[PDB]
């Protein structure tokens, strides 16, 4: 009964910032050089465990694996380099990571033949906002902010600090599309879950080091895009030499007084 799975492939993360039309929320960009059988799929980072010192690790033993498989739309691009992938910022936040090139994303498409998809009736989205300030963010407001979304059970957006387990009454669901559904048939619920289960959820899924808040970690600490135009006579060369396919020796030294 599960959705039949088309070709699955890995791809190199790219921070090359594209348009990423704001209309949709979870979409990506792939090179047009290859054929894309489907526009809908799942993406999943591949965690690289570097902290295996002192033997012990963070594998399935006493530590579960967060939801790597996250549904996202797919669409080609001619400018993006071949064998490369660009992710919407919302995707980066969903994966609990900042934009970063070179990350290897496992991905796999689907097909458009399925009735389990909620064909209209009762698309009860569980917007389980667990933040503070008792914000008046309405279900209608979130809808306006969440339209054009392919939701799936147990996924979190830390930017809004919102956890969602899409529900159809008491029947769950993993997929949905704005285009194929009527906006009336989606129901938005605004509440705050018990702080105990929220604490447990963050302890089990949100790592203690990750804090998506861009302003929380001040990076725009007076970093104006200063241009030292004459000295660019060197910069323009360096990048080329650095971007040159072949480097005679791996190193280049920049020297100054």
């Amino acid at each position: 009964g599960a959705i039949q799975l088309l070709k699955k492939v890995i791809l190199r993360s790219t921070v090359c910032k594209m348009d990423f039309p704001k209309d949709n929320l979870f979409v990506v960009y792939i090179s047009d050089g290859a054929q894309l059988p489907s526009q809908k799929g799942y993406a999943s980072i591949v965690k690289c465990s570097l902290r295996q010192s002192k033997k012990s690790d963070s594998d399935n033993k006493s530590v579960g694996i967060p939801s790597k498989k996250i549904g996202v739309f797919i669409k080609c691009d001619s400018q993006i380099p071949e064998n490369h992938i660009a992710l919407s910022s919302h995707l980066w936040d969903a994966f609990f990571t900042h934009p970063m090139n070179g990350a290897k994303i496992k991905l796999e498409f689907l097909q458009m033949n399925q009735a389990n998809i909620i064909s209209g009736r009762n698309a009860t989205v569980n917007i389980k906002y667990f933040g503070k300030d008792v914000p008046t963010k309405s279900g209608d407001q979130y809808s306006k902010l969440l339209g054009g979304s392919l939701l799936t059970n147990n996924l979190i957006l830390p930017t809004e600090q919102i956890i969602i387990e899409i529900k159809k009454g008491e029947s769950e669901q993993q997929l949905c599309n704005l285009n194929e559904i009527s906006n009336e048939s989606v129901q938005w619920k605004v509440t705050q879950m018990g702080k105990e289960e929220v604490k447990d959820i963050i302890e089990r899924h949100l790592p203690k080091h990750y804090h998506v808040k861009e302003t929380g970690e001040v990076s725009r600490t007076s970093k104006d895009e200063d241009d030292f135009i004459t000295v660019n006579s060197i910069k323009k060369e360096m990048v080329n030499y650095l971007t040159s396919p072949i480097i005679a020796t791996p190193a280049i030294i920049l020297d100054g007084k």
Binding site: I10, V46, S49, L50, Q52, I65
Partner: protein
Amino acid sequence: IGHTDIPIANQVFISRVGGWLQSQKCFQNIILTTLKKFFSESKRILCQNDLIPIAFDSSMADLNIAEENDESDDEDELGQYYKNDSLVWFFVTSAELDCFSKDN
């Protein structure tokens, strides 16, 4: 002999072949993982007293990417993400089976 007629073993004792590579404590785990994968890829054919070489990318040593990447689909894009650099050998010392044949 036809591939059908080749008996299937149950327990196989393999003595790791002594080698400078096999010694490094920092490597052993990646080596045994490489063996587990290589046998997991598909069926294999072996003989008593034989030897098995493995080629692996030592650069992945401390990069202990978790096993939960079950049967990584694009092991080819991973292999090009890798580059097997160092080689090891393994000795098959015994195989357990209860289907006796002329060519055990």
